[PDB]
């Protein structure tokens, strides 16, 4: 096969692929690799236009969502951060394959472990301490929530970077952040 | 891929720079066409700053403030295989490495251009 079936990503160097506050104002790099019952993931978000380049005084949190259908296929509409033309699928070289994902449930957060109505349960969250712009003097928290913004028979991933309250007038960018979760299949 | 290798364009203040980026598409390249031009200025220390895009069959600009309203795609038909751009009224602040990224899943290509701007029009 020309592609790797254990990896789903946004390609390593995606162009602005999110319209968070305004049209294409952010670059979200996300790579998910399946390793048995656990998916090793790495996420990164950076502002490139609008308010995401100069954190508003009243903002305290910046987050993105990724909703998947019952087959583990991304749905490119609200609230999914990635715009519809955004690249997402199996890895093939430094790009993605155009083949539809047929083993998506292997990358989805286990609904038994993280039930859809359990988004507020600690177990459905992986919270860590990280640093804005990688600057160790600017600590923030990244909270990954599983299946919290899911429809029904669906799945989701939520990334919440909080504590931005006192980093006003600065560009928003996160370092490469790691996370993991138990797979559906 | 792109038809031109990494080059260096030396121009003078006031002039306009034509940055080439012509590409060819394979039958395999079926993903949506994606063009992104980035810049690594010489003055400040920022790198890979977005300049202009061609995403979802639409042009998006005004990402790099210091370059506002002076960057436009030269071709009137991007899809045809030309992602070249212009930088009107060149200034000394415009010096840096400009990168052209042409993607069409699974295809991907990129070119780097070192733009140099001289105060007085002379390269002898």
Swiss-Prot record, chain A:
<comment type="similarity">
    <text>Belongs to the adenoviridae fiber family.</text>
</comment>
<comment type="function">
    <text>Forms spikes that protrude from each vertex of the icosahedral capsid. Interacts with host receptor CXCAR to provide virion initial attachment to target cell. Fiber proteins are shed during virus entry, when virus is still at the cell surface.</text>
</comment>
<comment type="subunit">
    <text>Homotrimer. Interacts with host receptor CXCAR. Interacts (via N-terminal tail region) with pentons.</text>
</comment>
<protein>
    <recommendedName>
        <fullName>Fiber protein</fullName>
    </recommendedName>
</protein>
Swiss-Prot record, chain B:
<protein>
    <recommendedName>
        <fullName>Coxsackievirus and adenovirus receptor</fullName>
    </recommendedName>
</protein>
<feature type="domain" description="Ig-like C2-type 1">
    <location>
        <begin position="2"/>
        <end position="114"/>
    </location>
</feature>
<comment type="subunit">
    <text>Monomer. May form homodimer. Interacts with LNX, MAGI1, DLG4, PRKCABP, TJP1 and CTNNB1. Interacts with MPDZ; recruits MPDZ to intercellular contact sites. Interacts with JAML (homodimeric form). Secreted isoform 3, isoform 4 and isoform 5 can interact with the extracellular domain of the receptor.</text>
</comment>
<feature type="disulfide bond">
    <location>
        <begin position="21"/>
        <end position="100"/>
    </location>
</feature>
<comment type="function">
    <text>Component of the epithelial apical junction complex that may function as a homophilic cell adhesion molecule and is essential for tight junction integrity. Also involved in transepithelial migration of leukocytes through adhesive interactions with JAML a transmembrane protein of the plasma membrane of leukocytes. The interaction between both receptors also mediates the activation of gamma-delta T-cells, a subpopulation of T-cells residing in epithelia and involved in tissue homeostasis and repair.</text>
</comment>
<comment type="function">
    <text>(Microbial infection) Acts as a receptor for adenovirus type C.</text>
</comment>
<comment type="subunit">
    <text>(Microbial infection) Interacts with adenovirus subgroups A, C, D, E and F fiber proteins as well as coxsackievirus B1, B2, B3, B4, B5 and B6 capsid proteins.</text>
</comment>
<feature type="glycosylation site" description="N-linked (GlcNAc...) asparagine">
    <location>
        <position position="86"/>
    </location>
</feature>
């Amino acid at each position: 096969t020309p592609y790797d079936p254990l990896t789903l990503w946004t390609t390593p160097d995606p162009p602005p692929n999110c319209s968070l506050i305004q049209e294409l104002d952010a670059k979200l790099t996300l790579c998910l690799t399946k390793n048995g019952s656990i998916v090793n993931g790495i996420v990164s978000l950076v502002g490139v236009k609008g308010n995401l380049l100069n954190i508003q005084s009243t903002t305290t949190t910046v987050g993105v969502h990724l909703v998947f259908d019952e087959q583990g296929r991304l749905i490119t509409s609200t609230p999914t951060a990635l715009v519809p033309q955004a690249y997402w699928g199996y890895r093939q070289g430094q790009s993605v394959s155009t083949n539809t994902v047929t083993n998506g449930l292997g990358f989805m957060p286990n609904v038994s472990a993280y039930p859809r109505p359990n988004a507020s349960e600690a177990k459905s969250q992986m919270v860590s301490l990280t640093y804005l712009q990688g600057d160790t003097s600017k600590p923030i928290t990244m909270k990954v929530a599983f299946n919290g913004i899911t429809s029904l028979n669906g799945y989701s991933l939520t990334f919440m970077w909080s504590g931005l309250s006192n980093y006003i007038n600065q560009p928003f960018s996160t370092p490469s952040c790691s996370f993991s979760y138990i797979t559906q299949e | 891929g792109i038809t031109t290798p990494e080059e260096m364009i030396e121009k003078a203040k006031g002039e306009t720079a034509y940055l080439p980026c012509k590409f060819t598409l394979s039958p395999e390249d079926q993903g949506p066409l994606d063009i992104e031009w980035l810049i690594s200025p010489a003055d400040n220390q920022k790198v890979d700053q977005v300049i202009i895009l061609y995403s979802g069959d639409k042009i998006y600009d005004d990402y790099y403030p210091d370059l506002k309203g002076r960057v436009h795609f030269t071709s009137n038909d991007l899809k045809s295989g030309d992602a070249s751009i212009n930088v009107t009224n060149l200034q000394l602040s415009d010096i840096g490495t400009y990168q052209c990224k042409v993607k069409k899943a699974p295809g991907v290509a990129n070119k780097k251009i070192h733009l140099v701007v001289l105060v007085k029009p002379s390269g002898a």
